[PDB]
């Protein structure tokens, strides 16, 4: 037979219609990802909960060398702490506020230009990016630069491509070169690191591959989120007029726009560890599952309605931050991050609207986000 | 009907003008406003379109007129000698500086990088604003205005508006700064208006359509051009061997580049047998240069990038009346770009396969959204 290709489709303002089909009709199914490999695709609520807990299903293993892959790759100590202290909101008593300002200059750089102005450079990364220089400690003065290395390294790809290995050691570098800068970095995932091997009981590319991977993931999930929230809110001005009557109402509303955005472009990859019947479907020990989290979180046995964007929902228990032992370490980082954008976001430009009618938004293609290359808007 | 953008991807020529043209040299097509047009594709038949004074380019903006996409005096002096080789003596080695600045910044921090962002787009914003005489300063912003003036719309949409006011105004405050502008077009305004013998409105609009068309056509042909040359190094190796071939070369990879996504309209004034197809007055005329620069009659192996052809003859700059203003110095921007590109990073190459660069929608322009490269 014709198997299914995954990924689904790279427009992301309307759940892909295959989501919806394939949840119905076979919540497990066998898939064609871009390398030519077959995985298991789990696109229904009950059966994905079931994936990200059960831990048979590894991450880990994603990155083996021969198991099978949905793309190509591109790239213990006690340092957990040093981590766990960094995306803690409550060990930056200061973050809340500085956000705040941040998301204001930027916002009122742009007003000063004036209508119309693109959401993403002038907004989204640019923000996204100095959220994660503060996580880091580092000045944001190379933001573009680190955007920019962003732009390779969350490339999905059938095969494997030189430059991706060039661009990890490229950005590996610059992480290596803040750290070990003369007037050494106090302040910081970086601060914390160099306190931490004075102590006397890791190597300094170890601890660069940490800062870079977590301004990587956070960077890029945070920046193609809150293009999502923001597409939503011009789409939806109701709701930009709810938040601006009810400001309370912000923190269940990232909560349901999390649900709702398609922010996430590829799936949640494990390794299967065992042999375990999932659904009606036997899976084998060493074939690949792709927790489809579109799929879960628009799944109507658990969420009513859930094409209809909506903030008053009884109860929301959505995967967008994943399930299990992986759970997202940023969940609140990320959501206080998009809260924050968004209350500023519509004080700020009461009159948001897309500048063109959103077919006609530029979805970049080849990427683990879905997002628009520009989003021009007016206000 | 056949379908009238053609392809978003420019890495080829697209497999159907090539049908077209050797079965329909003029067929009719449906534009992606639903308006109907003759797609003139072949290099006579072309030429023909370009030269013929009956088919009008002015009333293709006309009200009610068919159309491809959304509508989105002494004046002549202070053009032309803003856009002639011979006006700006010091132009080439200033130039060859920019491209030089912006090459090094990018060997600083190390590959990868992508030559849209950091090269192909500073580049022909800080050609053109020195064009106008303004300041570097905003080339963002003024960039960035280019992504939605140069949109191509089934319909229109609010905000190509906005956006045009946004900049007309812009050049307007250029033009009034109180230490008055000296140099550069707005420089030869603000004396055109202390002559005895034209508003602030129109003299913004030229200034703008000008940085609009120059900065667009020549980034998006720039990123072509390197494209070429990280795809067929031993192109490079030539230009390195053979330096004084960059005019050459900017020739052919003119003739051969893809960065023009739309074609050239006219109005036929009158009806006009062109082909074996008859015109009515009034109906929309589309030449496809690029089914032109590929026609095989008149370009031998048109497939295949030749630095050495005998003779050359393209409309890559248009033809007849209105061809291109700024030849020379669309040439000269490309000539410097590429010398500079070649001997700084000899190594060039994609950082990832060609058929995935991200090729953008909906613009006046075929251009990659970023062009990674190594080196
Ligand atoms: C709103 C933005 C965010 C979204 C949508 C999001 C969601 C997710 C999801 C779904 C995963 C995949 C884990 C799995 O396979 O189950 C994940 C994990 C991860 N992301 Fe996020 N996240 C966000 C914010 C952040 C931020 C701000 C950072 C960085 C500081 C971050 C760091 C991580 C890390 C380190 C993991 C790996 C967790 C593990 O393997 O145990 N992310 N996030
Ligand atoms: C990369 C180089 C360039 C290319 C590929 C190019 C090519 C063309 C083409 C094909 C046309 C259309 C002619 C027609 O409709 O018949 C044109 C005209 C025009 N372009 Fe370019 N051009 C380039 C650079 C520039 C520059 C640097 C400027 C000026 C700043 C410029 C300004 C114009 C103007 C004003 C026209 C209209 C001519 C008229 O209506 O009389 N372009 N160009
Ligand atoms: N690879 C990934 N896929 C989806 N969401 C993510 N969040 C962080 N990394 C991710
Ligand atoms: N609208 C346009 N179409 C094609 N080539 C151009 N060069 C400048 N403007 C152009």
Redesign the interface.
């Known amino acids: 037979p014709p198997l299914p290709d995954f990924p689904l489709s790279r427009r992301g303002d309307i759940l892909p219609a295959e989501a919806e089909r394939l949840r119905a009709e076979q919540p497990v199914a066998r898939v064609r990802t871009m390398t030519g490999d077959e995985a298991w695709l789990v696109s229904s609520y009950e059966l994905a909960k079931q994936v990200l807990e059960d831990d048979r299903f590894s991450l880990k293993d994603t990155a083996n060398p021969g198991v099978p892959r949905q793309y190509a790759l591109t790239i213990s100590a006690g340092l957990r702490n040093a981590v766990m202290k960094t995306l803690s909101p409550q060990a930056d008593r200061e973050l809340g506020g500085w956000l705040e300002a941040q998301a204001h200059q930027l916002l009122d750089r742009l007003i000063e230009?004036?209508?119309?102005?693109?959401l993403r450079?002038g907004f989204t990364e640019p923000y996204s990016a100095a959220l994660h220089c503060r996580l880091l400690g580092i000045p944001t003065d190379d933001w573009?630069?680190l955007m920019?290395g962003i732009?390779?390294a969350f490339?999905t790809?059938p095969?494997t491509?030189?430059?991706?290995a060039?661009?990890w050691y490229?950005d590996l570098?610059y992480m290596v070169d803040r750290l070990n800068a003369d007037p050494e970095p106090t302040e910081g995932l970086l601060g914390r690191f160099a306190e931490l091997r004075r102590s006397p009981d890791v190597s300094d590319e170890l601890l660069a591959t940490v800062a870079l991977s977590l301004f990587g993931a956070g960077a890029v999930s945070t920046s193609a989120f809150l293009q999502h929230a923001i597409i939503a809110l011009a789409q939806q001005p109701e709701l930009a007029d709810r938040l601006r009557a009810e400001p309370a109402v912000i923190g269940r509303a990232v909560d349901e726009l999390l649900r709702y955005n398609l922010s996430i472009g590829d799936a949640l990859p494990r390794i299967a560890l065992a042999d375990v019947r999932l659904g009606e479907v036997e899976i084998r020990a060493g074939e690949l599952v792709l927790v489809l989290i579109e799929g879960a979180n628009y799944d109507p046995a658990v969420f009513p309605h859930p094409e209809r964007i909506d903030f008053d929902r009884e109860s929301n228990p959505h995967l967008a931050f994943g399930g299990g032992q992986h759970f997202c370490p940023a969940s609140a980082l990320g959501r206080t991050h998009a809260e924050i954008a968004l209350t500023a976001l519509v004080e700020k430009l009461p009159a948001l609207r897309?500048?063109?009618?959103v077919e006609?938004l530029?979805w970049?293609?080849?990427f683990i986000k879905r997002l628009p290359?520009?989003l021009?808007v007016?206000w």
Not at 113 to 118: F, I, L, N, R, T
Not at 354 to 357: F, G, I, Q, T, V
Request: glycine residues 12%; without cysteine.
């Open positions: 230009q004036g209508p119309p102005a693109d450079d573009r630069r920019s732009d390779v490339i790809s095969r491509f030189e430059g991706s060039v661009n490229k570098g897309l500048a063109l009618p006609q530029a970049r293609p080849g290359e520009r021009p007016l």
